[PDB]
Design a binder for this molecule. Sequence first.
Ligand SMILES: *C(=O)[C@@H]([C@@H]1N=C(C(=O)O)[C@@H](S[C@@H]2CN[C@@H](C(=O)N(C)C)C2)[C@@H]1C)[C@@H](C)O
Length: 490
Amino acid sequence: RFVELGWIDSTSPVNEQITNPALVEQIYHSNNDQLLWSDLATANHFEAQLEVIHRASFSPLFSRQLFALKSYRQQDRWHEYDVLATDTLLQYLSYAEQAPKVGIAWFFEGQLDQPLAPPSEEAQLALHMAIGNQSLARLMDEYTPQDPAYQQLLQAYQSLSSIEFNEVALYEQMERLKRPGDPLSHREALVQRLALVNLDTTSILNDVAYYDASLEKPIKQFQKMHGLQTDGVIGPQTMKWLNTSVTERLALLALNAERIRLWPTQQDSMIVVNVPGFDMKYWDAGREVFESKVVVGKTTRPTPVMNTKLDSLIINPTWNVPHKIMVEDILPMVKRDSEYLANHHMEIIRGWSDPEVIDPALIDWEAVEPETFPYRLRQQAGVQNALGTYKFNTPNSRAIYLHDTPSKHLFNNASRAFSSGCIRVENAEKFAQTLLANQGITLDDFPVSTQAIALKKRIPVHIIYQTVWYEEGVLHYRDDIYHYDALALG
Ligand SMILES: *C(=O)[C@@H]([C@@H]1N=C(C(=O)O)[C@@H](S[C@@H]2CN[C@@H](C(=O)N(C)C)C2)[C@@H]1C)[C@@H](C)O
């Protein structure tokens, strides 16, 4: 009924499957009712690009279209294929344009289940042109992030895609742990599985019945690759990653490539925190000037994906204990431990406006119900302050900022989801120094007390969620700390 095309019949399912009949009609008329997709290499390139979106499991919309396309192809229904491909490429183009704007909706909040708006005029133009110059492939590639980050993940996806269904024995072992020097049953499976992730297995010795030196370094860099303690020990966490299928790895790659559409371009001066990587990097004038491990929010108080700017830096910050924390977390502990306040250098304050220190002794602690308790808590400046020596002020509606910690031992863990959402920074001192250097700010000597310092040039802070990324020659994988890789894996 609905698609007014001469060479498509009325009862074809394409009439219901198509999103923008109007715009498809126009394109086909402008090209004298000719097929855009009769070149195989071109259809295959576009089916490949939709497999990616399929595996990433974030768009039932594109999955529907791909199944339908793949179904028209198996039956040699090349007229129906042609028109549905054209409609689906319009969607791909809306998708390419909209993700950086509003893609947070599809990858974190909800999903791309409903047809997108048509693409911009600029895009419809580029398409018309591509149709005439027989360069649809170039058009699709042009509408992928021109980011080496993207292309490195796609390169790896393409390699692994080539060997998806090569069966490879599951790596097994007798005991839950297995240390250098122990007997080793399944050496073949283990080495095959180190190879899957393109670790160099060439120097590993053959048919040695034990976990020898030749295996230590490959195992330790497989561990590093997966952000695990490089202890050399084949335990459950190692085996989880060793024994992941190529299907599972391609899904991780797919999701993480598509996620790079969200991440806001790249700036010369910029700060990136990768949550599941529990790390962060400060670029300034094209240069990586600083990197550091961080602690991010716990699963229950997660660090959200967001973009803000670093406005100012506080040296020797006092910590104004927010209400929610005082009421639930702190007052009930001072109600029992009558030494809490003094140990944590935490003084009682009339109000944030009226900063009068009240001695804890002037208070009927039996009498206090935390919910209604009328004064406020303020931790004095110091090394043992919850914010340590440095607060990094990133003002935003969610009250998330970067700060030093006194609990520097927590950086020793592989998995660093301990905070109430804020981001604790190892080597805050160096971070402070490089910021001030690159702002053209000097300090005649280190301040006695609390010092606010506004940045001349505010830096964008991007907090991303990236479970796969390319860095110094190699592809890193990380556990799905906050469960957003959920659908990709099954
Ligand atoms: C940021 O997360 C909040 C602020 N920053 C820190 C932090 O990095 O965790 C917390 S302090 C810590 C978590 N809850 C407190 C607690 O459990 N007790 C028993 C005192 C200590 C702090 C809440 C916030 C400003 O957004």
